[PDB]
Design an enzyme around this catalytic site. Sequence first.
Site, mmCIF file in Angstrom:
data_model
loop_
_atom_site.group_PDB
_atom_site.id
_atom_site.type_symbol
_atom_site.label_atom_id
_atom_site.label_comp_id
_atom_site.label_asym_id
_atom_site.label_seq_id
_atom_site.Cartn_x
_atom_site.Cartn_y
_atom_site.Cartn_z
ATOM 1 C CG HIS A 149 -1.720 -1.210 1.398
ATOM 2 N ND1 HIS A 149 -1.559 -2.035 2.495
ATOM 3 C CD2 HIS A 149 -2.669 -1.799 0.613
ATOM 4 C CE1 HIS A 149 -2.389 -3.066 2.382
ATOM 5 N NE2 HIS A 149 -3.078 -2.938 1.257
ATOM 6 C CG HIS A 185 2.825 6.049 5.973
ATOM 7 N ND1 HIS A 185 2.483 5.916 7.298
ATOM 8 C CD2 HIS A 185 1.769 6.633 5.368
ATOM 9 C CE1 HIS A 185 1.256 6.372 7.481
ATOM 10 N NE2 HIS A 185 0.796 6.798 6.317
ATOM 11 C CG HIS A 231 -0.703 8.602 1.924
ATOM 12 N ND1 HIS A 231 -1.433 7.428 1.941
ATOM 13 C CD2 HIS A 231 -0.374 8.860 3.214
ATOM 14 C CE1 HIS A 231 -1.547 7.004 3.189
ATOM 15 N NE2 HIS A 231 -0.904 7.846 3.977
ATOM 16 C CD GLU A 237 -4.062 9.838 2.694
ATOM 17 O OE1 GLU A 237 -3.906 9.868 3.943
ATOM 18 O OE2 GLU A 237 -4.522 8.870 2.063
ATOM 19 C CG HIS A 265 0.246 10.675 6.942
ATOM 20 N ND1 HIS A 265 -0.695 9.921 6.269
ATOM 21 C CD2 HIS A 265 -0.092 11.968 6.734
ATOM 22 C CE1 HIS A 265 -1.566 10.729 5.687
ATOM 23 N NE2 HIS A 265 -1.215 11.975 5.941
ATOM 24 C CB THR A 312 -6.086 8.241 5.453
ATOM 25 O OG1 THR A 312 -4.717 7.835 5.412
ATOM 26 C CG2 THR A 312 -6.161 9.582 6.186
HETATM 27 N N1 LIG Z 1 -2.462 6.987 6.632
HETATM 28 S S1 LIG Z 1 -2.524 6.474 8.214
HETATM 29 O O1 LIG Z 1 -1.375 7.083 8.986
HETATM 30 O O2 LIG Z 1 -3.858 6.841 8.825
HETATM 31 C C1 LIG Z 1 -2.389 4.655 8.181
HETATM 32 O O3 LIG Z 1 -2.510 4.205 9.548
HETATM 33 C C2 LIG Z 1 -1.984 2.929 9.941
HETATM 34 C C3 LIG Z 1 -0.977 3.282 11.013
HETATM 35 O O4 LIG Z 1 -1.658 3.569 12.186
HETATM 36 C C4 LIG Z 1 -1.257 2.028 8.890
HETATM 37 O O5 LIG Z 1 -0.252 1.296 9.693
HETATM 38 C C5 LIG Z 1 0.862 0.486 9.223
HETATM 39 O O6 LIG Z 1 1.803 0.562 10.312
HETATM 40 C C6 LIG Z 1 0.974 0.508 11.535
HETATM 41 C C7 LIG Z 1 1.727 1.039 12.733
HETATM 42 O O7 LIG Z 1 2.551 -0.014 13.252
HETATM 43 C C8 LIG Z 1 0.208 -0.873 11.704
HETATM 44 O O8 LIG Z 1 0.953 -1.807 12.494
HETATM 45 C C9 LIG Z 1 -0.325 -1.471 10.343
HETATM 46 O O9 LIG Z 1 -0.438 -2.918 10.362
HETATM 47 C C10 LIG Z 1 0.465 -0.974 9.089
HETATM 48 O O10 LIG Z 1 -0.304 -1.081 7.892
HETATM 49 C C11 LIG Z 1 -0.848 2.620 7.527
HETATM 50 O O11 LIG Z 1 0.502 2.272 7.132
HETATM 51 C C12 LIG Z 1 -1.166 4.122 7.338
HETATM 52 O O12 LIG Z 1 -1.488 4.263 5.926
HETATM 53 ZN ZN LIG Z 2 -0.880 7.875 5.934
#
Ligand SMILES: NS(=O)(=O)[C@@H]1O[C@H](CO)[C@H](O[C@H]2O[C@H](CO)[C@H](O)[C@H](O)[C@H]2O)[C@H](O)[C@H]1O
Ligand SMILES: [Zn+2]
EC number: 4.2.1.1
Length: 257
Positions: free
Chosen positions: A61, A91, A93, A103, A116, A195
């Site tokens: 993703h 990370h 977007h 976003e 983010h 998100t």
């Molecule tokens: N775009 S976001 O920041 O709302 C979105 O949120 C998640 C993080 O809270 C998500 O998490 C990735 O890393 C986390 C934190 O450790 C989780 O463990 C999750 O399994 C993993 O996908 C996204 O990466 C992020 O887009």
């Molecule tokens: Zn994000």
Amino acid sequence: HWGYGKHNGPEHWHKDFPIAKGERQSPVDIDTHTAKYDPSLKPLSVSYDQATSLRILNNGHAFNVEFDDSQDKAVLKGGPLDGTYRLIQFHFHWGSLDGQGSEHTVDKKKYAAELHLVHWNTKYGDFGKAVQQPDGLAVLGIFLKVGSAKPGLQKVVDVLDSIKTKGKSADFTNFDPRGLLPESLDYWTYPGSLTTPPLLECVTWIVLKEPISVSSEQVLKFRKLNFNGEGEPEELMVDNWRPAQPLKNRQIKASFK
Ligand SMILES: NS(=O)(=O)[C@@H]1O[C@H](CO)[C@H](O[C@H]2O[C@H](CO)[C@H](O)[C@H](O)[C@H]2O)[C@H](O)[C@H]1O
Ligand SMILES: [Zn+2]
């Protein structure tokens, strides 16, 4: 499962994740002329001095740079926040072109990318528990526009050839995220959600006013990444952003006039 194409993208998410149409969803459009300056918001406090990065991962993703959050190393405090929020990962977007990819939007303007930086409230003991609380997470959102290079990003840009496909990761120690900040800490703040699915409504968003600039060659390397796993048909990792959602019963506060 879910993603960003015609058949599995943001318009479909509600079917598995009905909170997608919820009370406090992200991202949103930030209307600079409806945001209310709040003279009682404290300065924001970014303490990334002892930040310990470990690994970079392509999760199909986006890519995540993960940090050691086993102690209070890199923390976010002040501003609208109560107590301490520990950094776990950052990370991005981004888009298939420079006119799209962020976003949040500012007066409807889409930026090239959005960073983010994700923090969890230590009063809850671990990340899994904090996602279950309305004040569990604090995410520092920073916009990217294209211009001159961000030297503090280049190390991230260089490692990406080695995590091209879903499931790949590389070692990524001794990276310093202070190199991804702009000069100004001015921000907008509102209560919102992740998100990405599971779209949990547990986030205090802190979106910085001032964008960072990245070179065109820097974003082009993000766009060379892959949604697919090794040996599958190539789908370029581009346009991994959710569009803005209804503000509904919420107020965006500004730290500045
Ligand atoms: N775009 S976001 O920041 O709302 C979105 O949120 C998640 C993080 O809270 C998500 O998490 C990735 O890393 C986390 C934190 O450790 C989780 O463990 C999750 O399994 C993993 O996908 C996204 O990466 C992020 O887009
Ligand atoms: Zn994000």
